[model samples]
Target: TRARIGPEYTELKNLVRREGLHTVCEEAGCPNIFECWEDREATFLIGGDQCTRRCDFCQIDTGKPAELDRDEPRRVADSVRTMGLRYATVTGVARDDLPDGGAWLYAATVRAIKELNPSTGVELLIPDFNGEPTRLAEVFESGPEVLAHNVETVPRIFKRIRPAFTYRRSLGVLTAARDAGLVTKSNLILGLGETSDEVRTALGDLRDAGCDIVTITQYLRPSARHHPVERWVKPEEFVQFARFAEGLGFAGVLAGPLVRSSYRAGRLYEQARNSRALASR
Candidate 1:
């Protein structure tokens, strides 16, 4: 069965929100927030809740986001220390309004976490920075344990869901991250009219670009005004997709109904690290 909410989750949710911190789980109304929070495996949404894009699917607030918080990086690191997570994932609202595309903030957060908690692993779910290779490199240089960029949906649905970004550019960011000696990751949403063949090809593109980890998740429209689902990919189908990705040499694959880019990101990274080590032996 999928995840279900409980008191532990509610309390943790309330606690995180109380700090004026953001989470993609809360911001996007993710289906697995209960499981993650209850397990003390929360992924912080580092940037403020405001976004520049008016994507139909995302629930995060948009339209002229406030300036980047000067203290966000250290505050986020404190959250990591409080949770005692060996590995943590941090993402943020797309801050295209900033000159550096929030790359500095993204890098600084990773640095801060590593400084305060030296052994805690970090994964950053970063923006495409208009697919600028230099900016992608800048974020990578911050030494994130894992660097991820999501394509969201297939190429055809790009204009409809992510109007401001291009499919090729997103893929390029994933490629650039991988090429920079960082373990690269990405995610895609199903039930958005993409075919099974398209999903397989998408896997190939990620692998071709040297991506080591990927997650396939069901797309639940955030609101009636958002894009409607084309189909609900069954659990059995997700299993098949995961096996196919493993067959394609992906180091990690998390495919299921409620898989978010950062959901259980730490454990997945650990698993992938072990698997990669074992393969070499």
Candidate 2:
């Protein structure tokens, strides 16, 4: 259950703004912003808040982006420090227009965060990097504990919802991450007029790609101008999907209405990493 915002949440917001940081929660109108911020959980939206790809379902602004902020990474680390974050998650808008697709910046941010908070475990929710295998390797070498790239919707909806991305290519990104020895994860948004069969098929596709962590979230219409929410999936349906994904060898599954792509991100990686680290040792 999520709590409503109060004075503590305001303090959290003020702190982030004071650090001159950007966050997906504020930029995307996330429902749990207050709860997350006050709880000392922050998912930094790196690579600037503006995106190059304008997926219809997303509300983040799309346009030519501003120059990269040289101090952004340190500022993000400072915010994590101020929040006393033990688990840090970073994500970015697609910078396909850039040469490295912001992979270098992502790596730099991970390093800076570790420098500031040695105990903090970092996660990155990244773009597909056009699903180039070598680029995937480069990003993974930077060493984030987990790698997340959302599939958004089913294959059929891929062209419709995310024209910039290809379904097979999306799977390939997860495959590349898994092969790179990263704890790989992917996400899906339901209620996009997709059927049960589509959901099952998408899960099968993710499983085939060797993704271990899966999240299915209800799609809430961001605005009248944004993509319409076709149907609000019931809790029972999400539960069924959870069970199905788990049965298909998913190490973790988070499914619900309020669940976003990065929701439950920090703990999910920490728990999974702990288990794996114990085995390796």
Candidate 3:
């Protein structure tokens, strides 16, 4: 496994490790690690690797996280500069232990990256901040080009999958981000025993919340302890969902088997920006 990794991949691993940084690509066992790392693109995991919530579909370990690293933002900024990244995604585990659920760190990191490299576009795949609007507003004011909080699944199975999270709360997070005048995005995992109509309803909910971009991806069981996959959505169905999402006024929709929340995230961010520019004209 180590032999097949390219130089770019190796280089990023070393850089992040030297800086004592974490990445969701490795934490979540993402399949696109090779391609993204080769392109010098990565979704930096800001908070410590231990998540507060044990979502049924996620692979991230859950436990009491280590104390917040005050220097993490600077290191993330430094790594961005070292990698020469023009577009980057910064995400974190659910740090429910914190008073603001780590919103302060998110803001600081986004600001640091922008301050260090003004031309770089940053997107944040954040948690719900426990549905706290003030916390969300803080991050929204941080100047990220795109702000994402994945709803993860439809309403019917939402509780079964992410018991600690609520469908309404996730939508509220996106709505707040949109209200703050940020480009908002979300992800929904298919093949988790959801019906087509339910998926359509969730898409409608997101549109009503003024979400600009949406990603739909296949759900693979991370481990035996996680939720078993009820079905493997066909590629054609993903295309259909993409069409439906686009028709519902979503500026950008990425739906496929391999498309994760941050998959080719920069391209989607630009596409959403172009769509907004064109619409304004």
Best-fitting candidate, measured by TM-score? Answer: 3
Residues 1-281 of candidate 1: C-alpha lDDT, one tens digit per residue: 77787877777666676776655567666667777777666678877777888766676667788878979999889877765556678888788888888888999999999988887888998878888777777899998988988887777777777888888888888878877878889988998889999999988888888889989998877778777889999989999999999999999899987546777787778877787779879
Evaluate all candidate structures by whole-model CA lDDT and list the values in order. Answer: 0.81, 0.81, 0.87
The prediction achieving the highest lDDT against the true structure is 3
lDDT of 2 by residue, 1-281 (tens): 54877876787777767766567677667777766666556688888767999898886779888787767788788877886666678888988778888877787788888888887778888888887776777788878878888898998888787888899998999888898898988888998889999999999999999887888998877789888888888889989999999899787788897556767776677667776777799
Per-residue CA lDDT of model 3 for 1-281, tens digit only, reads: 53257998888888777766666777677788887787667778789889999888887789999999989998888878877776789988999999889999999999999999787889988988888878888899997999998898998899787989999989999888998999999999988889999999999999998899999999877778988888888889999999999999998899997646788787888899998999899
Give one clash count per candidate, in the order shown. Answer: 0, 0, 0
- Please list the residue runs of candidate 2 whose C-alpha ends up more than 4 Å from where it truly belongs after superposition: 1-21, 26-29, 274-281
Superposed by TM-score, candidate 2 places the C-alpha of residue 132 at a distance from the truth, in angstroms, of: 2.2
lDDT of 1 at 130: 88
lDDT of 1: 0.81
Q: Is candidate 1 or candidate 2 better by TM-score?
A: 2
Question: How much is 131 displaced in model 2, in angstroms?
Answer: 1.5
